[PDB]
Design a protein around this ligand. Structure first.
Ligand SMILES: CCCCCCCCCCCCCCCCCC(=O)OC[C@H](COP(=O)([O-])OCC(O)COP(=O)([O-])OC[C@@H](COC(=O)CCCCCCCCCCCCCCCCC)OC(=O)CCCCCCCCCCCCCCCCC)OC(=O)CCCCCCCCCCCCCCCCC
Ligand SMILES: CCCCCCCCCCCCCCCCCC(=O)OC[C@H](COP(=O)([O-])OCC(O)COP(=O)([O-])OC[C@@H](COC(=O)CCCCCCCCCCCCCCCCC)OC(=O)CCCCCCCCCCCCCCCCC)OC(=O)CCCCCCCCCCCCCCCCC
Ligand SMILES: CCCCCCCCCCCCCCCCCC(=O)OC[C@H](COP(=O)([O-])OCC(O)COP(=O)([O-])OC[C@@H](COC(=O)CCCCCCCCCCCCCCCCC)OC(=O)CCCCCCCCCCCCCCCCC)OC(=O)CCCCCCCCCCCCCCCCC
Ligand SMILES: CCCCCCCCCCCCCCCCCC(=O)OC[C@H](COP(=O)([O-])OCC(O)COP(=O)([O-])OC[C@@H](COC(=O)CCCCCCCCCCCCCCCCC)OC(=O)CCCCCCCCCCCCCCCCC)OC(=O)CCCCCCCCCCCCCCCCC
Ligand SMILES: CCCCCCCCCCCCCCCCCC(=O)OC[C@H](COP(=O)([O-])OCC[N+](C)(C)C)OC(=O)CCCCCCCCCCCCCCCCC
Ligand SMILES: CCCCCCCC/C=C\CCCCCCCC(=O)O[C@H](COC(=O)CCCCCCC/C=C/CCCCCCCC)COP(=O)(O)OCCN
Ligand SMILES: CCCCCCCC/C=C\CCCCCCCC(=O)O[C@H](COC(=O)CCCCCCC/C=C/CCCCCCCC)COP(=O)(O)OCCN
Lengths: 65, 129, 62, 80, 129, 65
């Protein structure tokens, strides 16, 4: 059993590992972006609620009970 | 519609007869006599061999890992090995980039909500895409 | 009572008996319907119904 | 052996060791289906019901049927 | 980290030795003696054969077309042929659906601007996707 | 040269043709949707222009020259 003249199997494994690592990088980036957008939407809804509350308060003052 | 088909068949027949490979001609003759398909048989043989060589691949991988780790690979390092390693590195880089693109499922990085480019997303001509 | 009958040794033998052929077809259906649901129900273009808050089963059964 | 809960039946030996040792095995008389017979894989040489139809092909057929069942409405939707 | 690797290598070696295929064992022994890879050689042989059999595939396609068009195929039609044709039809349908999905680059049909579902597009949590 | 016992090549060609036809269907659908959206955006811009013109006309009347 002589020494291997080629390293094809190791190269294939390394190819798979590199592709997997790239996939992990992309997944992490996408997940972070999704979390950021979720927080932004939550803030938008909170601002809308505050605006509606302010409008209701002004209408209540106009009612003058 | 028929003359073209006949011409293509004739050209392929001429090219098939032209090749001077004894094994290929023998297989073609045998399959023609039996009425079977040579290409499909070759595909099945290759798949069977690969199925039976999986653990051979594993053993070869471990042997190559031992060869590299032992330092014997670098003892006989030559320019050809350098060329192969450069090819290997290039493939690794391109695969990493492709993997990132597929992982984020987008060619370009996604835009953050606080970025001023959000307007572009709002002004899409076709929101479906 | 599970006493006997044809028993394939491995996957490749499931084609040696019509009944096990139908069985493996059914298993393929069963297992392949899950990836289909993954692709269909986690799609990018899938959009929640805008009127989903108009009505729900939770209010109805309550 | 077993395939899930289905166990392969095994024939109990009926001959004693002394009588068994005197038996002469002649596989030439055996059918081609059962030669080099192995209890752990008796159907290795058994013929296929349909020539060229592999088990993987049927598995893939079922998977394709499931994909059709789930995706046909995406391409040919119908109104209520 | 090392014991597991040794165990996996041992298991693969046992399985490789277990197989009783004369050709596979002979090829493995020859490649081990020469230090080459059997699986890669098999892959190259298969690709070469397929490259040399392309026009054979074309000729076989034309012969099969003539056989079907001539009506000889239906003369000897049997139940097995019916099963194969059903498999063929199923593959055609699934391929058509997949092709449509890829063609529109979306699992679901796109929403028209006049549809009331446009609001859903406007209210996307992440406009990037 | 006996008659063919299998029709693998014809089946492969048919598979390719079916996939191609599906691709054409999807492409046609997507193109129609894109044209519809382009027309909708053009109409939106036209409506915005008309609204701006009306606002400018009202402001001109307020100017009263
Ligand atoms: C957004 C996400 C969406 C996700 C959706 C879901 C995704 C899928 C999930 C899973 C779903 C369930 C599973 C379904 C599996 C279906 C596929 C399958 O099983 O395949 C096996 C099946 C064979 O199985 P089999 O019958 O059991 O084989 C028996 C033996 O093993 C046979 O062995 P063999 O020795 O024959 O082996 C070779 C064989 C096997 O090879 C393979 O296995 C191929 C790869 C299999 C997977 C294919 C998937 C296809 C899906 C859609 C496309 C995606 C990209 C695919 C990229 C493939 C790259 C190679 O090769 C072929 O099959 C060859 C096919 C190509 C034939 C080319 C002939 C062209 C002739 C044109 C002539 C025109 C003349 C016009 C003259 C007009 C004059 C007026 O092969 C196919 O079905 C091949 C389909 C190929 C479709 C290609 C379509 C490309 C797009 C259209 C063309 C556009 C560009 C060109 C235009 C040119 C102008 C016209
Ligand atoms: C022992 C227990 C067994 C199960 C008992 C019941 C249940 C118990 C639980 C376990 C169940 C596991 C599932 C059944 C086993 C399946 C694998 C198998 O045995 O294959 C035999 C078979 C070898 O034995 P054979 O029966 O003699 O087959 C001969 C040949 O296959 C030749 O076949 P042929 O002559 O009929 O040729 C047909 C034709 C047809 O071949 C093909 O076309 C190849 C397949 C193409 C893809 C089609 C979809 C495949 C399914 C994907 C989704 C699977 C979901 C369900 C999986 C559930 C798994 C639990 O072949 C070709 O033309 C060659 C293909 C060359 C093209 C390659 C490129 C393909 C690209 C595909 C394009 C689409 C990509 C997606 C995105 C596209 C975007 C545009 O191995 C293979 O060839 C399959 C290799 C792939 C293996 C992975 C399959 C999926 C995951 C399986 C997990 C297994 C777990 C087992 C647990 C055991 C623990 C120790
Ligand atoms: C949105 C659109 C975006 C578009 C972006 C752009 C698209 C591309 C455009 C074009 C760009 C330029 C061209 C670039 C080409 C690059 C590819 C290329 O040329 O490849 C040839 C190259 C071989 O070329 P060569 O060295 O000249 O070959 C010499 C001989 O021909 C060798 O002959 P042979 O006899 O060896 O032939 C077999 C050989 C050749 O076969 C092929 O050619 C394969 C197909 C080639 C194309 C691959 C493209 C990959 C692109 C990314 C993924 C897309 C989907 C691919 C689907 C492939 C389905 C088969 O097979 C392989 O390559 C085997 C590779 C797989 C190895 C599996 C080993 C896994 C071991 C894991 C152990 C873990 C232990 C952990 C223990 C931890 C303890 C603490 O093969 C590869 O690079 C294979 C890469 C495979 C990557 C797969 C990644 C999958 C995703 C990650 C895994 C996720 C699931 C599993 C996770 C499990 C948990 C960890
Ligand atoms: C005569 C004129 C000469 C030029 C004159 C000067 C220039 C004039 C200007 C025009 C030049 C045109 C281009 C030059 C010709 C190229 C074709 C050629 O000759 O190849 C022969 C070549 C055989 O030559 P060989 O040296 O004997 O090779 C031995 C073996 O290849 C074995 O090789 P190996 O031992 O190195 O093996 C390496 C390894 C490595 O193998 C591989 O990695 C296989 C390749 C994988 C794909 C990578 C990308 C390929 C490139 C695509 C983009 C090309 C852009 C540029 C094209 C320009 C065309 C004008 O192989 C494997 O492990 C086997 C591969 C198994 C995996 C199969 C599955 C692949 C899945 C791919 C997944 C990714 C898909 C994308 C989507 C993914 C989404 C997740 O045949 C092929 O294999 C061709 C396959 C690809 C065909 C399509 C290529 C693109 C279109 C070419 C059009 C050419 C028109 C010419 C008309 C002439 C009329 C008279
Ligand atoms: C002049 C003559 C002209 C002739 C022109 C002929 C043109 C023919 C065009 C193609 C026709 C294709 C018809 C078939 C496909 C129909 C698809 C369809 O309607 O699907 C919708 C239906 C679904 O309808 P649906 O859309 O209401 O269901 C969706 C349901 N939810 C929403 C819950 C998901 O799909 C199916 O039901 C698919 C079932 C599988 C189909 C394939 C069966 C193959 C055989 C398998 C059984 C046998 C296995 C044996 C194994 C063991 C052997 C020993
Ligand atoms: C044209 C197809 C090309 C195919 C290439 C595929 C390359 C993929 C490489 C990366 C994969 C991992 C990505 C991780 C992140 C995915 C997140 C997600 O779900 O995104 C979906 C993409 O998900 C999918 O559609 C695919 C889901 C999984 C598909 C599974 C494929 C088939 C698996 C077969 C399993 C059978 C058993 C095998 C066992 C092996 C392992 C033990 C898109 O929607 P979003 O925009 O993110 O948000 C949706 C919310 N409205
Ligand atoms: C993970 C990838 C999976 C790959 C699967 C691919 C399947 C595709 C099947 C259908 C293809 C035809 C579709 C027809 C319509 C395409 C339109 C188009 O370009 O769409 C782009 C996507 O197009 C691309 O990015 C790809 C363009 C072409 C890529 C070519 C790939 C490499 C080809 C190499 C050819 C080499 C020579 C071979 C010759 C063969 C033919 C003779 C996105 O469009 P929108 O998002 O709406 O607009 C974006 C801007 N607002």
């Amino acid at each position: 059993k002589a020494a291997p003249k080629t390293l094809h199997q190791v190269r294939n494994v390394a190819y798979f590992f590199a592709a997997w690592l790239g996939v992990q990088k992309g997944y992490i980036e996408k997940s972070a972006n999704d979390r950021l957008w979720v927080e932004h939407q939550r803030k938008v809804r909170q601002q809308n609620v505050e605006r509606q509350q302010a409008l209701d308060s002004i209408k209540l003052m106009q009612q003058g009970v | 519609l028929c003359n073209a088909a006949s011409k293509v068949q004739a050209r392929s027949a001429k090219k098939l007869a032209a090749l001077t490979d004894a094994g290929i001609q023998k297989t073609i003759s045998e399959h023609n006599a039996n009425g079977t398909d040579a290409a499909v048989s070759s595909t099945k043989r290759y798949l069977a061999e690969q199925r039976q060589l999986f653990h051979y691949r594993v053993v070869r991988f471990f042997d190559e890992c031992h060869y590299i780790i032992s330092g014997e690979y670098f003892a006989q390092y030559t320019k050809v090995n350098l060329i192969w390693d450069l090819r290997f590195l290039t493939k690794l880089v391109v695969l990493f980039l492709i993997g990132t693109v597929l992982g984020r499922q987008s060619i370009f990085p996604p835009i953050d909500p606080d970025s001023p480019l959000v307007e572009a997303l709002v002004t899409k001509v076709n929101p479906n895409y | 009572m599970l006493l006997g009958g044809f028993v394939p040794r491995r996957f490749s033998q499931f084609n040696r008996d019509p009944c096990w052929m139908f069985f493996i077809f059914s298993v393929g259906f069963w297992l392949g319907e899950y990836p289909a649901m993954m692709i269909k129900y986690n799609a990018r273009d899938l959009v929640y119904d805008p009127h989903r808050y108009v009505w729900s089963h939770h209010d109805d059964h309550h | 052996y077993n395939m899930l809960v289905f166990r392969d039946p095994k024939r109990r030996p009926q001959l004693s060791e002394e009588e068994r040792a005197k038996v002469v095995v002649n596989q030439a008389e055996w059918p081609e289906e059962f030669k080099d017979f192995d209890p752990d894989d008796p159907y290795k040489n058994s013929p296929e019901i349909i020539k060229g139809m592999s088990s993987w092909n049927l598995f893939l057929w079922g998977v394709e049927c499931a994909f059709i069942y789930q995706f046909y409405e995406l391409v040919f939707p119908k109104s209520i």
